[PDB]
Every structure is written in C-alpha cells, then in structure tokens.
Symmetry: C2
Subunit: 316 residues, 2 copies
C-alpha cells in the first residue's frame, strides 16, 4: 500500500529513536536522515489509516501559490493553522490592552478558564482581520512565510524574486535541469524568525515526460505534521505537472530531524493497528492550467475513505 | 565494508538509470532521490577500491574553512581543481590577447596541438596569479564560491554573514537544534553563476555527544565527483566535531540528480570488480581546535591502502 513508508517511519522512530531534549517540555524520540518516496501514479498519498482534512491543505497551498502572506485568505477559508503566529505579534502591541498572555498554547496546556478567554481573544483577533482592512494589514500579514519565500524573495538590490515562477518556466524550457530548486531558507532572515522554514527547499526533476519532486525537511513531527506535509508537496507536484503539461511521477520526502513527541505514543501505536485502504485519486480542472490563478473547486479528491481521526495533544 | 553504499550507488545507477540529456554531448544515466550514510566511527570513507588524492580535498576544505575565494591559496598547494573557472573569466578580458578559446575542455576533448598551447596559457595564467598580487586580485578571486557562501553570505543591508561560524557556536550552546543549517544556495545569485552550488546545503545534528551531518546534493557525477564529495563532508564533520569537543557519528549523503556519464561505463564496471580493503583512519591536531586556523599538517590520514586510480575522461 501507498502509505506504508509513513507507517514504516512511525515504526522506525519508535525503535531507533533516541531520547532527545525538545524546545518544549514534552520530550521526543528522534532519528536523523531518512528518505521515503511516493509513486504518485499509484494514487494520492493522503493517509487512509487516519482522517486528514484535505480542505485545509488545499487552501494553505493556494495561499502559498498566490504569493499570499495574509491571514485573511485563510480565515476566509476557515483555516486557522497560522493563527497563533500572527495573533502572537498582535498581543505584543500597544493596541492590545486585554488579558495578558506569555507563550500561550503551552500556557494553555495546563488549561484553566484562561484558555476559554484566550478563545475569545483569538475570536476577537480573527474577526478584526476578517472585517477591518487596516487591521488585517498590520497583524494579518505575516511577512516572511512560505508565500513570500517561494514567490517574493527579497534581493539586496531592493527587488523581489519569483523562485517558483522562474522554475516553472525553467521546467518548460529546460526540463532536464538539475538547477530546478526553490529554497525557503534565507540566511539573512533565519536568525530572527519565530519559525524558520521546516520545509527548507525542494527540487523538481523531469525523468520521462514525468515530473518528480524531492522535499528536504529539517525537522518533522511524525504524528502531527508529516501527514499534512506529504499531501502538500504531493499536490504541488500535481499542480506543477499540470501547468507544465507533464505527467506525474514520484514524490520523495527527505528528513533531517524526524521526531515523534512522547505525548503521541499511544496515538501512533493505535493508528498502526489499522491496515490501509485503497488511496484516493486527485483531479485538477482540465480547462484551467494557471496553478497560480487556481481556486478551491478546481482541485478534487476522489474516493477518500479513511479510518477516524486520532485525537492527540498538539505537540506538547 | 564502509564504502559499500558507494558501490551500491554505482550498481543502482547502472540498472535503474534512465537515459538523460546532459548539458554536454556525453549522455548520462541518472536517478533522482537517493540516500547513503557512513558511520564515521568505523573509519574514514575514502574510497579504497580507487586511489583518491586526499591532499587535494584536504587543501580545498581548508580553502573553504578560511573563507578564502582566491585561487592563489590552491595554486600555492598544487590544487588545480578550480583553475578553469577563474581562467575562463581571464580569457574574457581585454588584458587577454593571446590565442582564442571558446568553451575549452570540451573544445579540448577533440584535442589538437591546441590543447597543448592551452596548457601553456593555463601555465601562464596560474603563474601570474602565483607571483603578481594585483593579477591574483582581479582574476584569482572567484567571488561567489563555497568559501564566501559558508562564511560571507552578503546581506541586503550591506553586511556579511558567517553561517558556519554562527552554527559552530550554535552547536556549542544549543546542540539539540534542528536549525543547524548552512546553505550555499542564494536565490539572488543562482541565475547568473556559471556553477550554482552542487552541494546545496547541509545540516548538523547532535545525537549522543555525537555529531552527524547530512549533505543535500542537487547533482552528482557517480564516478568522478562523489568519491571526493564523500571525503569532503566526512572531514567537515570531523573538524566541526573536533572544535566542538564532540564525538563523531554518521555522515548522510542525500542526492537529487545522481548521474554517471556514459563515457565512464567501462571505468566504473572495472572499479566494481575490486573488493574493498579496510578503511583508513583520520587524526586531527589534539593541541589545536580552531578548525579555521587549521593548517595542512594538522590533518593526518592513516592506513590508506587503495587499489590503483582509474583513468577516465573528465565528464565528457
């Protein structure tokens, strides 16, 4: 089955993982250096042994493809994955006067009535960005995040580079280039970013009228993140192949520090009892090829029939 | 045996390689996405089934560690690996008046008396850089090459970043960082560089008082380059571990487009008939730890006993 490499990664970390100190409290078992590939001709690698919400990844990747960096687009899609990063910077403003918060989430793990009030403040935040323009502009924009990295790399000479746009054109004119890379890792920016890119850089490859892509990930949460991570870069592949009137091939996922938090052990043991079901199939609007001008309904997932979702504390 | 992964890579490319068009004339058999690791506690991975000149890699890596980008240091060490890159730019000067050359090497493959005269011009070049200061300065400096990438990344704000210096300090203060990366791939610079870095970026990892490093290589010549590539990043590991008073672990070598030119088939078939010998051992000056102020004699290779070198046309 298509998703086995994931199940194999989970097993592997559970046996060969060494205990490691995490910037959290919740320890991890980790490994370093690992590679797993997914023959995309055999189906779309969306975990079947666990329910993973495509809509969220579908919207986030369009957020990326649009060169977008503002939370409004995601909130305008019920995607709250990036809410904490932007919110954070907001509760660190003079405009902010309400109840204090010091590194929440973690501080919401030992959940008191506080977390609920925090829920009202996120509510109050999101809505602000959602209906007021100027607000959305100062706290809604995250800036140096994947959307700007991929398509708005900032030069020293003041301009802005469209890595992804250039490489897609490159694939089209010189499909046999070993220089088809787009990095999200900017040295000048990495030292002061709350979250330096987990997905450091990727490479395309045209084998036989077939596109393939390898992703190099510096850190990874086996349980929580990888399931999303796989679908995201397998989808990118599909979109680039689409625009490039090219067939699809293989998706290689390379890792630096792949880890599984201790507080996810029972959760991953269980998801491992399940046997995989046949994997879903993707569809992209045939009458549309500009993956940048792409919209939500142009991407359709078929036959996704997964086992229930596993509830686990979000990495701590 | 320690070097088997290499022999396995060679076999693999020879069976699973697909024919591909190369920016040359000499076609290649390639593969995409591959990982091989070398337990450095088991010996230094310098190919034994083929004689590979350590001195050259030893000097080149110090050239890198010194933040150096001038050919003089290498010529001052009989290292002529970077000679064509700098020479090239020289025969494209108004100061240059001698015999014409249009993409030599290749143009020297169909070798006429010309190649010999070309030999006299390289001679004439090298010596210029070797004894005259101002010359060395305009054509001897290559600029955007590994030495400046690793330790002199140029910001938009006009300054310069020492990636390697910062990460070594980082390893020392926070050895469990998943952010221990040094990239050599600068988007702003990649589109006009004759040779964008083949070694795109690397990551360190402290497991158990043990340093490990993974290298992500976008393109690779199985026969010619990888043998050098392995020793270089296995040595870096040893040097960083050294300064960091840390033990050594594993060296992972990840590849994007690993290929073997057609004109190396008989050469690699043959090197494959040989069985590996016990691998050599490294030694670094104990009474010295500043891997940046390191000198040639501070690195000693022991018990290197290889089979003869295999003569093969340099990638075309």
């Amino acid at each position: 089955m298509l998703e086995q490499p994931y199940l194999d990664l989970a097993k592997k970390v559970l046996d060969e993982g060494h205990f490691k100190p995490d910037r959290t409290h919740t320890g991890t078992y980790s490994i370093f250096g690992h590679q797993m590939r997914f023959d995309l001709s055999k189906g779309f690698p969306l975990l079947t042994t666990k329910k993973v919400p495509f809509g969220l990844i579908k919207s986030e990747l369009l957020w990326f493809l649009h060169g977008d960096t503002n939370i409004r687009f995601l909130l305008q899609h019920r995607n709250h994955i990036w809410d904490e990063w932007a919110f954070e910077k907001w509760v660190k403003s003079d405009e902010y006067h309400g109840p204090d918060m010091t590194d929440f989430g973690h501080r919401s793990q030992k959940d008191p009535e506080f977390a609920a009030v925090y829920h009202e403040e996120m509510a109050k935040f999101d809505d602000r960005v959602l209906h007021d323009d100027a607000f959305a502009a100062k706290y809604g924009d995250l800036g140096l995040v994947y959307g700007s990295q991929w398509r708005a790399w900032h030069t020293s000479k003041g301009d802005t580079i469209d890595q992804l746009g250039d490489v897609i054109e490159q694939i089209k004119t010189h499909p046999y280039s070993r220089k088809l890379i787009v990095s999200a890792w900017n040295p000048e920016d990495v030292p002061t970013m709350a979250l330096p890119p987990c997905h450091t850089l990727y490479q395309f490859y045209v084998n036989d009228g077939k596109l393939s892509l390898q992703l190099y990930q510096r850190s990874a949460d086996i349980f929580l993140g990888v399931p999303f991570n796989i679908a995201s870069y397998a989808l990118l592949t599909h979109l680039v192949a689409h625009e490039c009137g090219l067939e699809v091939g293989e998706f290689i996922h390379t890792f630096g520090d792949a880890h599984l938090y201790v507080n996810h052990l029972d959760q991953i043991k269980e998801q491992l009892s399940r046997t995989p079901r046949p994997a879903p199939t993707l569809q992209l609007n045939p009458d549309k090829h500009d993956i940048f001008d792409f919209d939500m309904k142009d991407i359709k997932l078929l036959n996704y029939d997964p086992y229930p979702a596993i509830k686990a504390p979000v990495a701590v």
